[PDB]
Design a binder for this molecule. Structure first.
Ligand SMILES: Nc1ncnc2c1ncn2[C@@H]1O[C@H](COP(=O)(O)OP(=O)(O)OP(=O)(O)O)[C@@H](O)[C@H]1O
Ligand SMILES: Nc1ncnc2c1ncn2[C@@H]1O[C@H](COP(=O)(O)OP(=O)(O)OP(=O)(O)O)[C@@H](O)[C@H]1O
Lengths: 106, 383, 379
């Protein structure tokens, strides 16, 4: 029906776990790029799926980092960048326990 | 579902007893200062919400409360071997006992395992199914401390640790919340417009009255977040100003559904604005446009939400938390309200709150009018 | 376009004089090492691109720069009271002068009054009309560590006369290509909904079997509303069908045009490479772009398997499209690639003054009339 922020975050969580499993990230330094690699593929890219995600709860509508927001008048790209920033912020909380689960996996 | 009916208090604060017979409907407790009104509300909130740990900070003997479905929770405080031992005895025979000093250590610690034990207990026995929202009598302080979470700590510091958890908005937080609701509503309207275009394009592939109806729909503020869709609808109106009915049916249905989703997405904000503006005289609250919520005078001037008086601030904090709602426990709703608003506030909030148990405590009997058969006069039994 | 016509260096490094006449395009300087080819490229890159403060780190007597239109710039390093002063005297314009030690202190501050004075001088005289790009001869060092710290890193071991270094390394052009593929994918995806929103208005504005057949043939998937449109087509109103056909054709044309910018670079790289094709693919599960090699066996490999030769081709064919001074393009290259490098790059860099400095004459095949042989007249 509609796509919310939590479905996008679950997709990003699955992609980050897959990246950790495949690329064999052992410390936070490789995961600092793996989080961006997982995050930029989980942003919606079909208009409707972007407005529906931005209209759901859990994600604010302002940039805590003003430099992360691109300087352009395209509103939909601004919202996609906001989704990317919020995805990185929320995935940094789960990065430590994902690393611990990967360490306990082997 | 489950509504507290018989609540018995034995030797609370080591000085008086009390026994209150409640109804499932509105209860207007009328008593002068000293009748234990707000201790009954703190006890009811801590029993219903499941925060039994707070009962370690109250000096009582037996606090037994019977719900509507027969279930009864009895809390007992005893002193054994110079240690205060408090036990929560249910009607199923499963009783959890804990020490007061352990609870004090736990409370200081959070600022754990005992709290987990209490949580496990209430969870397995389903003692937190119906929650209670507490509208405190010190809600003017919540404006000064600017739901937030440090307010409960400050209120427990200057009131004692028996106080239940406080989740009550301030006249500055409601402004931010309303702005968020407006923006999110715009985003949802834009999402519906994009989905409407995606379905309409494939659908339209597939009678002057239809053209008439389309003109009336497009003649009509409340716009989506994407300005290009507003330009699309303005172009539709201009083309209206400037067989094949199968496409026109889809166009009419798309415009009608656009207007209906526009009205549905703004339902809560318009209901809250109507409920507030029913009270106000020679002043109106609106959100006319970046979103901006404020007050529109009948002269057309626009002023921020700082300019409201004490009664209007009380109505804003009271009618907003009533909408975002269980059992509602309201403490002193007559603060800084004149007689005309006091005679109607309970009726307006009952229009806001239906199907929920309401327990209010008042000092003025002007709250009790219109529902005068539900008054419960209270008198403490001193020992 | 003020192309460089003639550069006269008098007593550069207090060693030799050099006077070179340049063509409007393809200045292929051929000469052995020790003739100041790099010294001439750095002088041109420090004149054309502004930034005259680098001349404070250079020992010279008189430097004259002639453009194509006739603008003359004369730079002198003159000392009187035991302090050297740089005199930048333009033709029919104001002249600026500054102390060498003041400029050294201004550069060491970065480790701004003179910088503002130089900026005002080059802005009021309009000296930055044409910008020349510098391709360094040590681009393997740029691969070792666009990048902004690389200029200071290279100036540490090559002196402060070295111009601004803006050159893309491998494993950085991979990120640039991945970002461009992702942005083009987002552009196509946004153009889908933009096409829907525009076609709604145009079909509302609008109110043969060959057009229906063309619409059925043009139906394809890149959400799946086009599949339902094709299913309905398989099972008066001419204007809306014309709008549908125009929208589908424009969608297909934008789909090709979005990836044409990277497909040109891929074809340019794959023209040289043999038994290996460089291309992009999207994953079956996550749909994320992979950019790398594709052997004829179907195996995929990262861009790190490439040899130094192929890496020079990657760094030179890229940043030629993203647009000229090229220093030593014959490094680590096969003789056939040295023969064909200028012919491949001249199609992608046409319309600008392309100065190249090579030690091997194999680079200058087919353009022997442009081969200007440098010769330092030692004092
Ligand atoms: N922490 C306490 N310890 C001991 N006695 C207390 C304590 N709090 C209240 N009391 C006693 O109980 C009485 C009841 O006061 P309580 O705090 O219940 O509110 P109230 O006087 O009924 O007024 P309101 O409902 O407007 O707050 C007080 O007058 C006081 O005598
Ligand atoms: N900073 C400097 N100070 C003094 N002499 C210098 C300086 N830089 C270069 N030279 C001299 O300039 C001459 C040639 O220098 P340069 O490296 O520019 O020439 P090149 O051999 O043509 O270079 P390349 O082949 O790398 O392009 C040499 O005699 C060298 O000693």
């Amino acid at each position: 029906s509609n796509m919310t922020y939590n479905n996008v975050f679950d997709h990003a969580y699955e992609m980050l776990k897959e990246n950790i499993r495949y690329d064999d990230i052992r410390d936070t330094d490789d995961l600092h790029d793996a989080i961006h690699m997982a995050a930029d593929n989980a942003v919606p890219h079909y208009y409707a799926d972007i407005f529906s995600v931005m209209a759901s709860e859990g994600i604010d509508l302002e940039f805590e980092d003003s430099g992360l927001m691109p300087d352009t008048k395209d509103v939909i790209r601004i919202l996609q960048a906001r989704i990317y920033e919020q995805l990185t912020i929320d995935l940094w909380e789960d990065a430590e326990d994902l690393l611990n689960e990967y360490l306990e996996e082997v | 579902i489950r509504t507290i009916s018989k609540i018995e208090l034995s030797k609370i604060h080591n000085r008086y007893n009390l026994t209150v017979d409640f109804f499932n409907d509105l209860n207007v407790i009328h008593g002068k200062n000293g009748a234990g009104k707000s201790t009954l509300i703190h006890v009811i909130a801590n029993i219903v919400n499941g925060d039994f740990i707070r009962f370690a900070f109250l000096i009582f003997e037996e606090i037994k409360a019977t719900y509507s479905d027969g279930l009864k929770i009895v809390i007992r405080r005893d002193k054994i071997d110079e240690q205060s031992f408090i036990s929560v005895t249910l009607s199923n025979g499963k009783y959890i006992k804990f020490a007061v000093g352990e609870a004090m250590a736990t409370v200081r610690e959070i600022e754990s395992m005992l709290a987990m034990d209490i949580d496990k207990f209430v969870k397995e026995n389903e003692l937190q199914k119906v929650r209670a929202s507490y509208f405190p009598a010190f809600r003017t302080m919540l404006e000064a401390w600017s739901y937030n979470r440090k307010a409960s700590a400050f209120a427990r510091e200057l009131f004692g640790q028996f106080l239940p958890s406080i989740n009550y908005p301030s006249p500055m937080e409601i402004e931010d919340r309303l702005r968020e609701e407006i923006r999110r509503a715009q985003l949802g309207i834009a999402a519906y417009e994009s989905r409407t275009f995606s379905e309409s394009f494939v659908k339209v592939f597939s009678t002057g009255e239809l053209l008439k109806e389309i003109e009336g729909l497009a003649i009509a503020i409340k716009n989506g977040y994407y300005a290009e869709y507003s330009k699309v609808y303005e172009e539709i109106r201009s083309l209206i100003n400037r067989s094949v009915s199968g496409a026109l049916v889809v166009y009419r249905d798309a415009l009608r559904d656009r207007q209906d989703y526009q009205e549905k997405a703004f339902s809560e904000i318009d209901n809250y604005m109507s409920s507030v503006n029913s009270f106000l005289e020679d002043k109106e609250m609106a959100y006319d446009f970046y979103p901006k919520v404020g007050l529109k005078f009948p002269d057309g001037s626009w002023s921020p939400i700082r300019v409201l008086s004490s009664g209007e601030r009380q109505l804003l904090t009271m009618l907003y938390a009533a909408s975002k709602m269980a059992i509602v426990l309201i403490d002193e709703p007559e603060i800084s309200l004149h007689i005309d608003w006091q005679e109607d506030l309970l009726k307006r909030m009952l229009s806001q709150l239906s199907g929920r148990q309401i327990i209010v405590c008042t000092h003025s009997p002007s709250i009790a009018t219109g529902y005068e058969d539900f008054m419960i006069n209270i008198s403490p039994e001193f020992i």
